């Protein structure tokens, strides 16, 4: 391809690129509001969390760290902030 709009890449192909290889690098992670099944308390949790986050009310583990995104425990529903 000799002629191509480098300033306006297709957003579909722009999203398949590595996170450092976009026009402006941008994280693909986000923050979530996690509802444990036991109670109702807003707890902001990073998507790629490295910590076993526990809610303040009961010392129950909300998520377990993995290689990438943290894994939410059963009965826990997340909503992206």
């Amino acid at each position: 391809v000799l002629v191509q709009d480098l300033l306006h890449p297709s957003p579909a192909t722009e999203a398949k690129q590595h996170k450092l290889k976009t026009l402006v690098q941008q994280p693909r992670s986000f923050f979530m509001d996690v509802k444990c099944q036991g109670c109702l308390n807003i707890t902001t949790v990073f998507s790629h969390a490295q910590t076993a986050v526990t809610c303040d009310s009961c010392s129950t583990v909300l998520c377990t760290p993995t290689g990438g995104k943290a894994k939410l425990t059963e009965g826990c529903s997340f909503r992206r902030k």
Binding site: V1, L2, V3, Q4, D5, H8, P9, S10, T13
Partner: protein, 87 residues
């Protein structure tokens, strides 16, 4: 190229590639000159009246001639929504 008195001492002002603006040499036998007929409102081809493009042999060798014509013809209206600037 011309002298001080203004006479064009240059012989053979050469052609240039429509895609890359390179000079098409006198022995570049991979270079072609596309001639495309004009069509009147009746759907008939107008005799002896053409849109002309020239491509250097370099562009044709890389296989970009097809994509260059898609772009060049769309800008001149010979084509619609076939070539996209953004990929």
């Amino acid at each position: 190229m011309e002298n001080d008195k203004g006479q064009l001492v240059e012989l053979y002002v050469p052609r240039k590639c429509s895609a890359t603006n390179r000079i098409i040499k006198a022995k570049d036998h991979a270079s072609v000159q596309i001639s495309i007929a004009k069509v009147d409102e009746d759907g008939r081809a107008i005799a002896g009246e053409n849109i002309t493009y020239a491509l250097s042999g370099y562009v044709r060798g890389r296989g970009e001639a097809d994509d260059s014509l898609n772009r060049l013809a769309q800008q001149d209206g010979l084509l619609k929504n076939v070539w996209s600037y953004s990929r």
